[PDB]
Design a protein around this ligand. Structure first.
Ligand SMILES: [Cl-]
Ligand SMILES: [Mg+2]
Ligand SMILES: [Mg+2]
Lengths: 320, 320, 320, 320, 320
């Protein structure tokens, strides 16, 4: 009934072993206290008892000089990534460029590379969708926008905000580690595991410098991702403003047409009032006259036209 | 008539005693001046005369190596929290992970844990309400939004702004304490109470390091809370923009329909003017003709239809 | 004709004396150059020739170990504050908590307390007015807002922006003083007036520490005021957005009702066109028939109703 | 054909001499390289080869212990300022407060004073215009705003943004100089011209301290100007929001009136349909009856009134 | 099949040679590892193994004391710039002002000058287009804006945002290099190539100081560019707000005219209802009277006019 961790252990030779271990047993094996493996923070990287404990959203990892541990890897679609890349990356000719460096360098490089790839994939999924939605929405020949595309844009904007928050947290953690040389020195766990051995093992190679360079590379990649996401958000805001202006302009055009038609209808009704008054079933002295009917019809139509033209001219003067 | 403090004292063994003490008596017992216990700031943490005086909104606490004091705990619903958790947390197997550390560590951990739990509970109450209100409001099939839900959203946004201010103050205080090592050293009140004893009592354990780790943990939790609240505010702003665009699009659609109907009415009235003119009670030469009535009716209807179609085509050309 | 200062001098014993002194005479008495008393900055605090020269908007003060000087105190409603509080605060049992400390501590504490009280009073005047104006404006049952209340809100927002600027300047000055220990040491003017005497006069009491604590207290109070003002501005912006959404929703509802009525009027006019055509004074073959009139009337009314219903259904389909 | 500088030289005694000098000759005389006098930056202050080279927009100056040089002073309306103030300020009883200090102090004080006066004059020109334009625009009794005043406000806002950029650059340059003591020491060009002489010439007076105080004074003045400009921009934004709300409220009121009139017209047309149907030239059985005409007229008018009242009540219910 | 670099090598004497080299061969020749030439960052400047590796968007360069290398220069329109300026700039009398300095100074100066010229050209292309588009759009005499110009403005705003991001990255990289003296010292690659030779070769000239001055110059140029771009964005936002206000004012004016015409039409229809009622084909007692027809017509017209005037007065009262 005790809580357990689903642990995937990658050895220094790339061998992978998956099992389940009691939390107390894991603490005893790793020489860590219970508070060290709480993983309470959304993303964090810490060095406790010469062990690199890190969490990035759903990825919880513990790096020791002997091996790497992935915790709570189930129901996250991580099996493909783990069993297809990590044996190759840690113990092969993969994209990792820190192979001659100790195991922790390869481990942290692989973890940061996977996380940066996940963020870049999220951005590369979001960008075309947002771009095409904005292009459809800011189309100047549409009187009104599509509301389903508006909802899609809202969902994509929420996803982009979440991605920006994730990238900002990544950058903040990496920069906080890079700022202090003490954290960089602590990150070299293999160096501090046997300081006497590494006093002569390091033949002029600085582990702290290599860690600083790797973290700087990943921080620069995260900064590029953040810049791209910020540009996307700015473009979204500009497109929203353009949509507002387009809708207002269409409303103004429709209102102008409606006002002109209202002027025409008002003139027609104004002279139809005279027509109806002459059409009442009341006795008058103009029934005997013959040209009176045609004269009234002609003056009604001509006056309606003239009043409509005068009202249009007045509208043009008012709108300058 | 002198002002008094309602003091709840938790001993190192977890015993709880509630009473009322004169302010001067409290100053004499704690070895503190009057200005130290003013609690004038909304949130503050200070170390005065080897005592940790802190306030977080309605929670005022004084931590000494011997015991903990809660001041002005009445009419705040704090009795349940106090008498149900603190005896267990300070002197039991609770969630506190600093039990082997001196009493002040457990005290500050419990206080910070309670405050972070209160903030997290406020956020977890606000988030579903705001989410459901926005989902109802940004529904694309609604011609107009619900104004009662708008008022609810406004109240929830005010509450969220207050929560963000509280989280920001928490983060600022914790970060200000963490920045200077002097404050961290001062926080270890038991260490400085008897420096001669603790010169040998601390068998290789660094109290300052433990305090730094605890404060870093709580600062990271507060940072996560602040990130979540900022994401909620950004989502609120995006939903407001989407609501604006939806309302404008609905207005444009309704205006287009009204303009088309106005065109139809204008054409109908234009030919009804001819109908009325022919319907006047004035003598003419066309009463004798038989087909004239049907011809006039037919040309009126056909011309009304043709003018309506031409006006619709003109509107389509104007709106592109 | 030479410029003069209206000087109110408060002695160390609380005695108050008001007079007018030539600027050159004041410079000679205070041992300060002309540039020191320019008071060109809206708010500043400086230590020149062992004298604390400060200005906060309309309050210009010079603090020396012997006494305090208030300059240009006329036509500012400051007489009540001066002659009712300062004799009591500097030489009595007032709210000042630095009485055993040298005179400059009491002086600067009284000045900062008065300024923070003025800012807090401005905020406590602005807050209820803004709150009630927003509550009236964001009322969901109002079709349109009250424009006089809008102007009142604009004036209150301008006042709140000015208050925020004042609080920000206060915080910036206090934080700039607190950042450098040299400024804090300079602030202890009585300590540096006779360093030989104060080498033994200070029996274990640190004047710099007391000054730092006092400035920290006032900075925290100013930070609380700034947080409250920022919350007020954020609430104002949110209320403005809610007002915009409410007005747009009311416009949409009115437009929908107008469109439905336009559909009804259009159908009525469409069948009134047939009515008028049958009502023309032209010969036809349907006058002999008896049921034709009732048939035409019935079909006109029924078709008007049916076309209105069909148009309403079309509008419902269009608006989804 | 070689490029030349129009140089105005002010001697230590205030004598002014205007001439034109070849760029190479100026470099040889001042002991400076070509890159030093490029003046490529909008505003900069630098110390090269014991010479203070500064540019502030159109004002290019080179300060040496012997004299001051103004370059490219033509076609800028600077002749009045130069020949009316600088001889008086550098060698008289002007507003300069650094007369006993070496010549470079007076020179830099005069230059910074002129630039701060120019910025303050720009702000004092912009502020009344913007204030009166906003007051005219936010008038609650105007149905629509004046568009010419809108264009004036746009131009003034662009000018205010340019002024804010200039003030920000001024503040940034002054603060960057003040941050590093090395730059402040370099600014004392007369001190470093003959260090052996000034080792004993400076009888207890610190040139670096005086330079720091002068730069702090001008930085505080620039900060006050920036605060005023930021307040003006915030007021402009608030006035724009108030204008938006006023226009929306006026639109809503007009729409409500139009909707009520549309209800009235719809009821009138609904009963005029019955009137027209009874007015058709078709045989019926109601011509014989005498009271039928008055009954129809009365029911038409009464029903029109009742339907209008019912529609108004329905609108009131809908708008709550 | 191995990846290759298209390398353009500029010798210290200005000779240019273009070829293609295997990546491994380039690493061997430059003494650099594979990770050094990844060019994964949008812009970066680094010093690896005494070589300055930099990338600025599409421009990838490697600076060694012997020569300069441009990588991946094809299909970028860079041939003109390379073969027309760089031989002249590096080995001639060009705009470079660091000719007596070692080769790396000239190389980095030329690269930074080209990049700053590219950014300035982009800004100088964007600014007139944006200015003219805004001037056309904010024209107060236009009832509605041009939507094609709106799309052009949106595209130009996206381009301006990209330019701002590029300038910000440039400034960040230059400032990060300038902040640390270690990076500035590393940048002097020729100095560290043969430290023994340059211990006496540098006859009182500080390479680090020259590098700092050059980087400061380019940072100031980039800051000016960023200020101009920010001013352009602020002007764009202000113009958008002015366009919104203009469209709202035009809508309000059109709505007022439509409401007045609706009042007129409503009065005309109200009295036409009486006209139609009197015009019904129903028997009455007023056919015998002679003046009744003219009386009805006169009262209808007069009442229509009076009701229209009263409605206009009511509208004026409502709108204040
Ligand atoms: Cl509208
Ligand atoms: Mg609108
Ligand atoms: Mg008739």
């Amino acid at each position: 009934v005790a809580p357990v961790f689903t642990v995937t252990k990658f050895d220094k030779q790339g061998n992978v072993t998956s099992f389940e271990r009691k939390k107390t047993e894991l603490y005893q094996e790793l020489g860590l206290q219970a508070r060290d493996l709480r993983f309470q923070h959304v993303m964090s990287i810490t060095v406790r008892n010469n062990r690199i404990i890190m969490r990035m959203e759903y990825l919880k990892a513990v790096i020791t000089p002997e091996c790497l541990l992935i915790l709570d890897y189930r129901n996250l679609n991580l099996e493909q990534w783990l069993f297809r890349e990590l044996p190759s990356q840690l113990s092969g000719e993969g994209q990792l460029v820190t192979y001659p460096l100790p195991f922790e360098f390869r481990a942290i490089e692989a973890l940061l590379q996977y996380w940066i790839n996940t963020l870049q994939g999220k951005l590369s999924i979001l960008q075309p969708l947002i771009l095409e939605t904005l292009d459809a929405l800011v189309d100047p020949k549409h009187s009104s926008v599509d509301r389903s595309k508006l909802h899609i844009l809202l969902q994509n904007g929420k996803s982009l905000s979440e991605l920006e928050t994730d990238i900002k947290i990544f950058k903040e953690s990496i920069l906080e580690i890079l700022d202090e040389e003490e954290l960089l020195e602590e990150l070299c766990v293999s160096k501090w595991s046997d300081p006497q051995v590494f006093e002569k093992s390091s033949a002029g190679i600085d582990h702290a410098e290599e860690m600083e360079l790797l973290l700087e590379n990943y921080y620069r990649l995260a900064d590029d991702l953040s810049n791209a996401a910020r540009e996307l958000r700015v473009l979204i805001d500009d497109s929203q403003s353009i949509i507002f202006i387009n809708l207002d302009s269409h409303r103004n055009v429709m209102m102008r047409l409606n006002l002109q038609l209202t002027m025409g209808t008002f003139s027609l009704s104004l002279f139809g009032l005279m027509g109806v008054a002459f059409g009442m079933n009341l006795e008058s002295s103009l029934e005997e006259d013959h040209r009176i009917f045609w004269l009234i019809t002609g003056i009604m139509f001509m006056g309606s036209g003239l009043i409509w033209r005068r009202l249009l001219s007045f509208l043009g003067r008012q709108l300058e």
